[PDB]
Structure 1
Amino acid sequence: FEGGQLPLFRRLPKRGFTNINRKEYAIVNLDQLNKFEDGTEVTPALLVESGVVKNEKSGIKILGNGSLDKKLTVKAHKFSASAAEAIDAKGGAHEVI
């Protein structure tokens, strides 16, 4: 309240809506995948067991920040470009499910 002066949040206009169905994923970074080992065939369940992801929210998304220092195959729901080249450079596939 502002002593009868028009309050801030009516001076300003509303905008936007909510897309009731969003696909937002529990994200796992590149450097968070160097807690696995070489060649080892990671999966969403395996990384849930490892606890790197506290819950699979609507899938798993691999993003690219750090480095592998490794050579291994993966299987997740969605990938970014950087993730793709970063996996393929060291060798190892990424089977999208």
Structure 2
Amino acid sequence: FEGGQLPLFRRLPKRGFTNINRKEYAIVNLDQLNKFEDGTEVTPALLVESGVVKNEKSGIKILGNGSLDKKLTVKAHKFSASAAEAIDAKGGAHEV
């Protein structure tokens, strides 16, 4: 309340909407993938069990922050272009 001056949150306008079908992904970066032994088959179940991912949300997306230092076969619902490139370049493989 501002003593009768039109309050801020009435002088400013509303914006936007919320998407009913909004999707959000549990994200995993390459630096986090670095904990699995080279040759590992990283899957959503393995990520959850290992505790890298707690809440899977709409699925696992791999992102490219940090450096991958291991060869892995990564199964996830989505990949950043950079994440897929790093996984392949380290000799590993990725699949959606």
TM-score normalized by the length of structure 2: 0.97
Distance 2:30 2:92 in 1: 14
Q: How many angstroms does 1:85 deviate by? A: 0.8
Tell me how far 1:55 sits from its aligned partner.
Answer: 1.4
Following superposition, the deviation at residue 60 of structure 1 comes to 0.3
Partner residue of 2:11? 11
User: CA RMSD, aligned part only?
Assistant: 0.7
Aligned to 2:62: 62
Instruction: Give the Cα separation in 1 of the matches to 2:52 and 2:86.
Output: 19
Q: Aligned pair count?
A: 96
CA distance in 2, matches of 1:33, 1:41: 11
- Supply the distance in 2 between the matched residues of 1:59 and 1:25 (Cα, whole angstroms): 5
Residues 37-58 of structure 1, C-alpha deviation per residue, up to 9 Å, x if partnerless? 1011111001100001111111
What is the deviation of 1:72?
Answer: 1.2
User: For 1:10-53, what per-residue CA distance to the aligned partner results, in whole angstroms no more than 9, with x for missing partners?
Assistant: 10000100001111011011100011110111110011000011
Q: 5+ unaligned residues in a row in structure 2: which ranges?
A: none
Q: Report the Cα distance in structure 2 between the residues aligned to 1:26 and 1:90, rounded to whole angstroms.
A: 23
Please, what TM-score do these two structures have when normalized by structure 1? 0.96
Which structure: greater strand fraction? Answer: 2
Question: Percent of pairs identical after alignment?
Answer: 100
Runs of 4+ in 1 over 4 A off after TM superposition: none
Q: How does 1:1-97 map to 2 (within 5 A)?
A: 1-96=1-96
Residue segments in structure 1 that go unaligned for 5+ positions in a row: none
